[PDB]
From Swiss-Prot, chain B:
Coiled-coil domains are critical for microtubule binding via the formation of a two-stranded coiled-coil structure in homodimers. It is found in: Cytoplasm, Cytoskeleton, Microtubule organizing center, Centrosome, Centriole. Disulfide bonds: none annotated. It comes from Chlamydomonas reinhardtii. It comes from the Eukaryota. Disruption phenotype: Basal body-defective and flagella-less phenotypes due to disorganized mitotic spindles, reduced rootlet microtubule bundles and cytoplasmic microtubules, and associated with abnormal cell division and slow growth. Heterogeneous cell size as a result of unequal mitotic cell division. Homodimer. Residues 8-61 are annotated as: Homodimerization. The gene is BLD10. This is Basal body protein 10. Microtubule-binding protein essential for cytoskeletal organization (e.g. rootlet microtubule bundles) and flagellar basal body/centriole assembly. Belongs to the CEP135/TSGA10 family. The chain holds residues 4 to 66 of 1640 of the full protein.
Length: 68, 63
């Protein structure tokens, strides 16, 4: 997961130092920006879900404390 | 359309000796996206680890 982000940064960094991505209205440039946005959305979704998992587990843990 | 307004504005700025104004703006956007992407990924990983711990703690309560 962090490996995927790492790769994304690697590809991005190549593109920036590489030529042909200097024109932000070039389709390749706009889709590069679009990919990053979508990556952030998916990652933000996953973060939200795992926050729920953690929250449910905290509830299960606190449920034991009361049983004793 | 907005695309033509920017193209016109681009041309008039090249004439005045100014580089494409969209490029700097685009770079800043990417800067913020990268930062958010990494920050959110760190938090994700951190919570993901907290779940593992809690999972063990829950496994111990059972047995």
């Amino acid at each position: 997961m962090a490996i995927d982000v790492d790769r994304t940064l690697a590809v991005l960094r190549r593109k920036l130092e590489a030529l042909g991505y200097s024109d932000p209205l070039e389709p390749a440039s706009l889709q590069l920006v679009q990919k990053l946005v979508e990556d952030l959305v998916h990652t933000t979704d996953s973060y939200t879900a795992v926050k729920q998992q953690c929250a449910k587990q905290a509830q299960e843990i606190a449920a034991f404390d009361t049983r004793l």
